[PDB]
Write a protein that binds this ligand. Structure first.
Ligand SMILES: [Ca+2]
Ligand SMILES: [Cl-]
Ligand SMILES: [Cl-]
Ligand SMILES: [Cl-]
Ligand SMILES: [Cl-]
Ligand SMILES: [Cl-]
Length: 161
């Protein structure tokens, strides 16, 4: 086992990893985008999944862990406070991945969809992902949907190797 990062452009509900990170909202609602796809595939994981901004809460669907990570909605937060909460959400993901003992995890880029406040946050969100996950030994598979984002994420992964 050599821990790795990979990126795939496809629906995270089809992931091939041992657990999934949901781009969750604080109230545990079905939501939109990635969150709604996670709700359709693992609805049982939404039982008592509500948790504050900047935190993560894991709920099992059977034995399959869904890590509900709540990034900030940048429409509501200032750039400085939102940046702090986004970094914090990813730190909580790293703790949960470690506690669960999984060999791999499927992760989306938090706060880059409807919580982005209308801005391109690929680099900001990806760099906070790396800051949290670099010290873990899980294989990390990042899921995206946009063709140009796939290329940019792949370039960012490859240039550190
Ligand atoms: Ca918070
Ligand atoms: Cl590996
Ligand atoms: Cl797909
Ligand atoms: Cl929401
Ligand atoms: Cl989002
Ligand atoms: Cl994307």
């Amino acid at each position: 086992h050599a821990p790795s990062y990979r990126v795939k452009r496809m629906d995270i509900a089809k992931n091939d990893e041992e657990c999934v990170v949901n781009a969750a909202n604080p109230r545990g609602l079905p939501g939109h985008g990635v969150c709604k796809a996670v709700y359709k595939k693992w609805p049982e994981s939404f039982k008592n999944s509500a948790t504050p901004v900047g935190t993560a809460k894991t709920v099992m669907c059977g034995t399959y862990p869904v890590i509900h990570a709540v990034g900030p909605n940048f429409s509501n937060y200032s750039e400085s406070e939102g940046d702090r909460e986004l970094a914090a959400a990813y730190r909580e993901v790293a703790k949960e991945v470690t506690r669960l003992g999984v060999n791999s995890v499927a992760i989306p880029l938090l706060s880059t969809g409807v919580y982005s406040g209308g801005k391109d946050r690929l680099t900001q969100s990806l760099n906070h992902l790396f800051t949290a996950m670099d010290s873990t030994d899980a294989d990390v598979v990042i899921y995206c949907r946009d063709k140009e984002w796939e290329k940019k994420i792949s370039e960012a992964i490859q240039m550190r190797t």
